[PDB]
Structure 1
Amino acid sequence: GLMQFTLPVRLCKEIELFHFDIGPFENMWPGIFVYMVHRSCGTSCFELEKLCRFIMSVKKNYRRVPYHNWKHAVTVAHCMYAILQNNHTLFTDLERKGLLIACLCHDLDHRGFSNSYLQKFDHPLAALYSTSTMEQHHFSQTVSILQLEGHNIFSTLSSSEYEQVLEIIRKAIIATDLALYFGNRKQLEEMYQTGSLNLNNQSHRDRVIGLMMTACDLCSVTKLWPVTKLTANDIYAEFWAEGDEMKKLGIQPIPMMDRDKKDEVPQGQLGFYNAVAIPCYTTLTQILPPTEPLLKACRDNLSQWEKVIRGEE
């Protein structure tokens, strides 16, 4: 009832900032997330015994892969917490509840392979889900864990609020398929610029929540340079393992995934900052002005990759 979560002073202050790193102590990630739900939503959004049991079943269903792991899940939820606290009054009680859970669950049971590799391997999940393969699997696993005895954190919601929140989570999670991002942002751009963008239109909200999810998912590019640089080793370690597996199938992987082409990482990160990250955080700042720090930090790390290419580090 009267049981707050508190953090040490440095975390209490730094958790409010977009660039916050959740640190190397795994056993504090759960308390960090609960802290965020309580400040974002209220101490009464979720029955604490159910929330805790949900958090630990979710953790157990992330795998020990280099990048798409439990640490990524809590990183992406933290970024969503930063967005929600800097845009307090633009979001319903249900959106606040659904979106933090959506981020924690958004890569459940990820095996460290692209939708592409599932399809070329002919993995069962590719027959069951022809597009957004892993992301439909991630949502599926969220519903599984919600249905476990003592895990329904949404038990108090009305029959209809329950369906609305699971629909918020489904779209939120589908949106983390980067193939769907390019379309979603082009439309969000055109709607903002012609002035058609309207946040009372539910299909316009959907698109905005979609872009928030891509922002939160990419937030490793908005960290202090040494966090951004080291995280890149993790994500390339998956990409190269996939490359190896593509070669095992008799297929030349794209350069991104070919560990023979390590040399070209800086140029590839440049490409990705220009094609993906900068556009994302640009359009997000236009739509939601207080998210500007994500854009500014992204721009800083781009400049840090330009420096790497010029032999200046």
Structure 2
Amino acid sequence: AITNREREAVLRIEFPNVDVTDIDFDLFQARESTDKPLDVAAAIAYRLLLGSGLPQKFGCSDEVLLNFILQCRKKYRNVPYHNFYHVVDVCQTIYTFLYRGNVYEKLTELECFVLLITALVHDLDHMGLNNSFYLKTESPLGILSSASGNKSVLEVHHCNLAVEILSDPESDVFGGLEGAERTLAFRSMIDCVLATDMARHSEFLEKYLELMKTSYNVDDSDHRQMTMDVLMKAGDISNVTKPFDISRQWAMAVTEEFYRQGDMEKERGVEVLPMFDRSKNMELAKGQIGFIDFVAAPFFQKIVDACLQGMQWTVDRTKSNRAQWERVL
């Protein structure tokens, strides 16, 4: 359970002069301009969701929504990248895809609510170590994954914790739903989180594009779910689509986390990939350009051209940042 000092420390935060729905929203400045960045991060998610009118529409009370965010926050660790700020950022970004990029037209209101909730649970208890680390080192979570036959080590873990938070009525944001609606809420959340495993990036992207070769059918379960998966994925690789100052700060965070993994691998005598090598050094610009060219740019370009036409700015900003990193070299 949550303490009343904890709830009130978040409840009292308001943003009258800072628009949390904007594509230019700067979470780094929001964090840096307070002495309580975890409270401000929780208030951004809370006010963003209450402001939309979605929780209220699905019988999710203000207290339950606030309890849920705080339970999620407790399960986020002090790591450079996969910390609470990342999921608040993903939530805020998906919101912009839905309501600034008009993707809300392609999904039901319930599915928009589920997506925003899912963003907040999608990396629960991440240790700043990737799936490969768990498998190479034969860690208890890796062993658990191998024996159960589910290769997405962290993603299954993220789902288990989401289901656990939601098992408590005081934090069940889906507690106000019933029957088909409730099943859809859990099924869609679980499928979205499982879709975030990057070892399955091209699988999800190509399953989506083939479904969109024919007319978009909202009556089709697969069409909606694949759209939900693509938006969760887009939120996850969205740091490339932000203003250069913001994009650079996420680039530095992911670099430091990756380097800490590499250092732990060196200490354990397991294989280290160049991307995770701290002592030897690669320019930040090079990492980002490679990331954009082989992953981020084709992803955004293909989904935009296939169906998500309103998300054109994501393609534009990624290119502008790619050009800026090229200048850095």
Q: TM-score, normalised by structure 2?
A: 0.86
Counterpart pick for 2:153 among 119, 130, 133: 133
Q: What is the CA–CA distance in structure 1 between the aligned matches of 2:111 and 2:55, rounded to whole Å?
A: 16
Residues 39-80 of structure 1: per-residue CA shift (max 9 Å, x gap): 334361311111111111110110010000000010000011
Counterpart pick for 1:233 among 234, 252, 255: 252
Are the counterparts in 1 of residues 88 and 120 from structure 2 also a CA contact under 8 Å? yes
Counterpart pick for 1:203 among 222, 234, 238: 222
2:47 pairs with 1:35: yes
Offset of 1:221 from its aligned partner?
Answer: 1.3
Partner of 2:183: 163
Partner of 1:269: 288
Q: Structure 1 residues 251 and 264 mapped into 2: Cα distance closer, same or farther (>3 Å)?
A: farther
Q: Spell out the pairing of 1:7-156 with structure 2 (5 A cutoff).
A: 7-9=15-17, 11-12=18-19, 15-22=20-27, 23-24=30-31, 25=34, 26=37, 27-42=39-54, 44=56, 45=58, 46-86=60-100, 87=102, 88-130=104-146, 131-156=151-176
Q: What is the CA–CA distance in structure 1 between the aligned matches of 2:238 and 2:95, rounded to whole Å?
A: 12
Q: What is the CA–CA distance in structure 1 between the aligned matches of 2:66 and 2:301, rounded to whole Å?
A: 36
Offset of 1:135 from its aligned partner?
Answer: 0.6
Are the counterparts in 2 of residues 41 and 96 from structure 1 also a CA contact under 8 Å? no
Residue identity (%): 31
Q: Structure 1 residues 169 and 298 mapped into 2: Cα distance closer, same or farther (>3 Å)?
A: same
Name the stretch that deviates more: 135-144 or 287-296. Answer: 287-296
Residues 223-262 of structure 1: per-residue CA shift (max 9 Å, x gap): 2111111221111111111111211222341100011332
Unpaired stretches in structure 2, ≥5 consecutive residues: 1-10
Q: What SS class does the counterpart of residue 260 from structure 1 fall into?
A: coil
Number of residue pairs matched by the alignment? 303
Are the counterparts in 1 of residues 204 and 229 from structure 2 also a CA contact under 8 Å? yes
Name the stretch that deviates more: 296-305 or 74-83. Answer: 296-305
Residues 205-233 of structure 1: per-residue CA shift (max 9 Å, x gap): 22222111111011211221111112211
CA RMSD of aligned residues (A): 2.1
Counterpart pick for 1:243 among 262, 266, 283: 262
Q: TM-score, normalised by structure 1?
A: 0.90
Q: What SS class does the counterpart of residue 128 from structure 2 fall into?
A: coil
Name the stretch that deviates more: 83-92 or 102-111. Answer: 83-92
Are the counterparts in 2 of residues 41 and 97 from structure 1 also a CA contact under 8 Å? no
Offset of 1:30 from its aligned partner?
Answer: 2.0
Are the counterparts in 2 of residues 176 and 213 from structure 1 also a CA contact under 8 Å? yes
Q: What SS class does the counterpart of residue 179 from structure 1 fall into?
A: helix
Q: What SS class does the counterpart of residue 126 from structure 1 fall into?
A: helix
Q: What is the CA–CA distance in structure 2 between the aligned matches of 1:102 and 1:63, rounded to whole Å?
A: 18
Q: Structure 1 residues 139 and 41 mapped into 2: Cα distance closer, same or farther (>3 Å)?
A: farther
Q: What is the CA–CA distance in structure 2 between the aligned matches of 1:270 and 1:42, rounded to whole Å?
A: 37
